Design an enzyme around this catalytic site. Structure first.
Site, PDB file in Angstrom:
ATOM      1  N   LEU A   4       3.587 -13.005   2.564  1.00 35.26           N
ATOM      2  CA  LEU A   4       3.273 -12.020   3.602  1.00 35.26           C
ATOM      3  C   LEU A   4       1.782 -11.716   3.676  1.00 35.26           C
ATOM      4  O   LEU A   4       1.291 -11.214   4.688  1.00 35.26           O
ATOM      5  CB  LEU A   4       4.051 -10.722   3.364  1.00 35.26           C
ATOM      6  CG  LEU A   4       5.566 -10.885   3.400  1.00 35.26           C
ATOM      7  CD1 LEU A   4       6.260  -9.582   3.007  1.00 35.26           C
ATOM      8  CD2 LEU A   4       6.002 -11.344   4.789  1.00 35.26           C
ATOM      9  N   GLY A   5       1.068 -11.994   2.596  1.00 33.44           N
ATOM     10  CA  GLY A   5      -0.361 -11.749   2.559  1.00 33.44           C
ATOM     11  C   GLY A   5      -0.862 -11.620   1.138  1.00 33.44           C
ATOM     12  O   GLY A   5      -0.122 -11.850   0.179  1.00 33.44           O
ATOM     13  N   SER A   6      -2.126 -11.238   0.996  1.00 38.17           N
ATOM     14  CA  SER A   6      -2.724 -11.088  -0.318  1.00 38.17           C
ATOM     15  C   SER A   6      -3.945 -10.172  -0.238  1.00 38.17           C
ATOM     16  O   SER A   6      -4.445  -9.863   0.858  1.00 38.17           O
ATOM     17  CB  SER A   6      -3.131 -12.449  -0.894  1.00 38.17           C
ATOM     18  OG  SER A   6      -4.233 -12.998  -0.169  1.00 38.17           O
ATOM     19  N   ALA A  59      -7.000  -8.101  -3.306  1.00 40.20           N
ATOM     20  CA  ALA A  59      -7.752  -8.206  -4.546  1.00 40.20           C
ATOM     21  C   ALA A  59      -6.862  -8.322  -5.777  1.00 40.20           C
ATOM     22  O   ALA A  59      -7.276  -8.863  -6.800  1.00 40.20           O
ATOM     23  CB  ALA A  59      -8.683  -7.002  -4.694  1.00 40.20           C
ATOM     24  N   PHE A  60      -5.640  -7.815  -5.693  1.00 39.85           N
ATOM     25  CA  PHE A  60      -4.826  -7.700  -6.899  1.00 39.85           C
ATOM     26  C   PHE A  60      -3.720  -8.738  -7.011  1.00 39.85           C
ATOM     27  O   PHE A  60      -3.232  -9.012  -8.102  1.00 39.85           O
ATOM     28  CB  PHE A  60      -4.216  -6.304  -6.986  1.00 39.85           C
ATOM     29  CG  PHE A  60      -5.236  -5.215  -7.093  1.00 39.85           C
ATOM     30  CD1 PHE A  60      -5.895  -4.982  -8.288  1.00 39.85           C
ATOM     31  CD2 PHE A  60      -5.540  -4.423  -5.995  1.00 39.85           C
ATOM     32  CE1 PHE A  60      -6.844  -3.978  -8.391  1.00 39.85           C
ATOM     33  CE2 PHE A  60      -6.487  -3.414  -6.093  1.00 39.85           C
ATOM     34  CZ  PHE A  60      -7.138  -3.193  -7.293  1.00 39.85           C
ATOM     35  N   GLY A  61      -3.319  -9.320  -5.892  1.00 38.96           N
ATOM     36  CA  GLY A  61      -2.248 -10.296  -5.945  1.00 38.96           C
ATOM     37  C   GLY A  61      -1.790 -10.795  -4.597  1.00 38.96           C
ATOM     38  O   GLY A  61      -2.456 -10.611  -3.580  1.00 38.96           O
ATOM     39  N   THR A  62      -0.642 -11.454  -4.608  1.00 38.42           N
ATOM     40  CA  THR A  62      -0.068 -12.038  -3.417  1.00 38.42           C
ATOM     41  C   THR A  62       1.283 -11.385  -3.202  1.00 38.42           C
ATOM     42  O   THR A  62       2.056 -11.247  -4.141  1.00 38.42           O
ATOM     43  CB  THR A  62       0.076 -13.573  -3.561  1.00 38.42           C
ATOM     44  OG1 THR A  62      -1.223 -14.148  -3.764  1.00 38.42           O
ATOM     45  CG2 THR A  62       0.716 -14.197  -2.329  1.00 38.42           C
ATOM     46  N   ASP A  99      -7.715   2.818  -4.196  1.00 34.11           N
ATOM     47  CA  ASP A  99      -7.760   1.723  -3.213  1.00 34.11           C
ATOM     48  C   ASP A  99      -7.103   2.109  -1.873  1.00 34.11           C
ATOM     49  O   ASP A  99      -6.411   1.299  -1.240  1.00 34.11           O
ATOM     50  CB  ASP A  99      -7.091   0.464  -3.792  1.00 34.11           C
ATOM     51  CG  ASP A  99      -7.335  -0.791  -2.938  1.00 34.11           C
ATOM     52  OD1 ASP A  99      -8.368  -0.868  -2.236  1.00 34.11           O
ATOM     53  OD2 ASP A  99      -6.471  -1.696  -2.939  1.00 34.11           O
TER      54      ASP A  99
HETATM   55  N1  ANP Z   1       6.326  -3.671   0.690  1.00 37.00           N
HETATM   56  C1  ANP Z   1       5.759  -4.443   1.623  1.00 37.00           C
HETATM   57  N2  ANP Z   1       6.496  -4.811   2.697  1.00 37.00           N
HETATM   58  C2  ANP Z   1       5.929  -5.576   3.637  1.00 37.00           C
HETATM   59  N3  ANP Z   1       4.685  -6.060   3.685  1.00 37.00           N
HETATM   60  C3  ANP Z   1       3.981  -5.681   2.608  1.00 37.00           C
HETATM   61  C4  ANP Z   1       4.429  -4.897   1.558  1.00 37.00           C
HETATM   62  N4  ANP Z   1       3.423  -4.711   0.620  1.00 37.00           N
HETATM   63  C5  ANP Z   1       2.406  -5.368   1.123  1.00 37.00           C
HETATM   64  N5  ANP Z   1       2.673  -5.985   2.319  1.00 37.00           N
HETATM   65  C6  ANP Z   1       1.770  -6.790   3.136  1.00 37.00           C
HETATM   66  O1  ANP Z   1       1.119  -7.734   2.303  1.00 37.00           O
HETATM   67  C7  ANP Z   1      -0.306  -7.656   2.516  1.00 37.00           C
HETATM   68  C8  ANP Z   1      -1.014  -8.055   1.251  1.00 37.00           C
HETATM   69  O2  ANP Z   1      -0.862  -6.943   0.373  1.00 37.00           O
HETATM   70  P1  ANP Z   1      -1.834  -6.671  -0.836  1.00 37.00           P
HETATM   71  O3  ANP Z   1      -1.656  -7.777  -1.808  1.00 37.00           O
HETATM   72  O4  ANP Z   1      -1.497  -5.253  -1.314  1.00 37.00           O
HETATM   73  O5  ANP Z   1      -3.318  -6.781  -0.260  1.00 37.00           O
HETATM   74  P2  ANP Z   1      -4.043  -5.655   0.560  1.00 37.00           P
HETATM   75  O6  ANP Z   1      -3.352  -4.357   0.357  1.00 37.00           O
HETATM   76  O7  ANP Z   1      -4.042  -6.040   2.063  1.00 37.00           O
HETATM   77  N6  ANP Z   1      -5.620  -5.583   0.050  1.00 37.00           N
HETATM   78  P3  ANP Z   1      -5.884  -4.884  -1.466  1.00 37.00           P
HETATM   79  O8  ANP Z   1      -6.481  -3.438  -1.252  1.00 37.00           O
HETATM   80  O9  ANP Z   1      -6.936  -5.713  -2.121  1.00 37.00           O
HETATM   81  O10 ANP Z   1      -4.590  -4.795  -2.343  1.00 37.00           O
HETATM   82  C9  ANP Z   1      -0.533  -6.213   2.948  1.00 37.00           C
HETATM   83  O11 ANP Z   1      -1.760  -6.035   3.651  1.00 37.00           O
HETATM   84  C10 ANP Z   1       0.679  -5.967   3.843  1.00 37.00           C
HETATM   85  O12 ANP Z   1       0.422  -6.491   5.141  1.00 37.00           O
END
Ligand code: ANP
Ligand code: MG
Length: 300
Positions: free
Chosen positions: A20-22, A24-27, A136
């Site tokens: 779904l994305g990533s 600084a902390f993970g994917t 964050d």
């Molecule tokens: N519980 C969830 N349900 C659906 N999409 C999610 C959920 N958690 C995270 N995402 C999506 O996944 C993306 C990546 O999340 P994440 O790894 O937390 O990076 P980030 O929040 O965009 N940047 P960062 O501040 O570095 O953590 C987010 O921006 C959301 O679009």
């Protein structure tokens, strides 16, 4: 700390299905949980941290993340500790608020914008009551459960690529993080919402941000924001941390504005945009949002 709030999963119990994305902390993955002995596949969100601390230390802070109980804060539900750390949370089909406001840039009314500000401040106030610092906060870390109901995610992931453009100056210069530095980040978050997801300090190198801030420059007034709204943001970015607003006060100020939304935000075609009828809210909740939550603030 109640350890019953955190379930430990075995790798066989779940499967990552799609990225779904990533950050600084993970994917983050859309995943499926298969309860032992059952044939159902239950959608979940799975965040696999990059680093891959001892397990007891990680597990100790996971209990804290699993202990948060507030309608506007995402709770950690499960964990799977192996060669990597995987965090299980509720999947949010609507995704993060940053993407949402960008995708609906021409569809979003003042009542939604102001209520989201309220809910984010409620979630942050709860964290402050728990004496927990987020570190964050940003629109990318606010999730949309329904268009009427948003939740803060990913607090304290440091414990267990620094976001300079969301950070308080004292965090930039000295890596000091407090509730009042969370307020700074809240200010930037609100600015992201009000610009419908613009990038803060676009085209300005991260290395130049601290000197820009020391000169007294700040993010510009968004086109839809009246001066009263913009003054709240500016107050969040004061050099003196203790002169910044408190989350308790922000709840009250934005709740007041939500009661007379057109006086505080100027949006073309705003009268043609309302919060959902009781009928539509009831349907949404029945299908997507059964949990308890304070009433949204309606116009007087
Ligand atoms: N519980 C969830 N349900 C659906 N999409 C999610 C959920 N958690 C995270 N995402 C999506 O996944 C993306 C990546 O999340 P994440 O790894 O937390 O990076 P980030 O929040 O965009 N940047 P960062 O501040 O570095 O953590 C987010 O921006 C959301 O679009
Ligand atoms: Mg995140």
């Amino acid at each position: 700390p109640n350890q019953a709030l955190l379930r430990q999963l075995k790798e066989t119990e779940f499967k990552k299905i799609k990225v779904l994305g990533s950050g600084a902390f993970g994917t983050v993955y859309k995943g499926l949980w298969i309860p032992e002995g059952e044939k159902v596949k239950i959608p979940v969100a799975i965040k696999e941290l990059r680093e891959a601390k001892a397990n007891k230390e990680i597990l100790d802070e996971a209990y804290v993340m699993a202990s948060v109980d507030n309608p506007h804060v995402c709770r950690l539900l499960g964990i799977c500790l192996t060669s990597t750390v995987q965090l299980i949370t509720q999947l949010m089909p609507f995704g993060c608020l940053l993407d949402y406001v960008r995708e609906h840039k021409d569809n979003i009314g003042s009542q939604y914008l102001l209520n989201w500000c309220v809910q984010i401040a409620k979630g942050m106030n709860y964290l402050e009551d728990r004496r927990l610092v987020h570190r964050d906060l940003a629109a990318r870390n606010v999730l949309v459960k329904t268009p009427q109901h948003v939740k803060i995610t990913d607090f304290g992931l440091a414990k267990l690529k620094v976001p300079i453009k969301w950070m308080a100056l004292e965090s930039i210069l000295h890596r000091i993080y407090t509730h009042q530095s969370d307020v700074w980040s809240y200010g930037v978050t609100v600015w992201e919402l009000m610009t419908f997801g613009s990038k803060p300090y676009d085209g300005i190198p991260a290395s130049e941000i601290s000197s820009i801030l020391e000169k007294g420059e700040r993010l510009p007034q968004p086109p839809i924001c009246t001066i009263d709204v913009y003054m709240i943001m500016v107050k969040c970015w004061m050099i003196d941390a203790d002169s910044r607003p408190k989350f308790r006060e922000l709840i009250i100020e934005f709740s007041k504005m939500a009661r007379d939304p057109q006086r505080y935000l100027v949006i073309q075609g705003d009268e043609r945009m309302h919060l959902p009828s009781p009928t539509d809210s009831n349907f949404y909740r029945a299908l997507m949002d059964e949990e308890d939550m304070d009433d949204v603030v309606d116009a007087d």
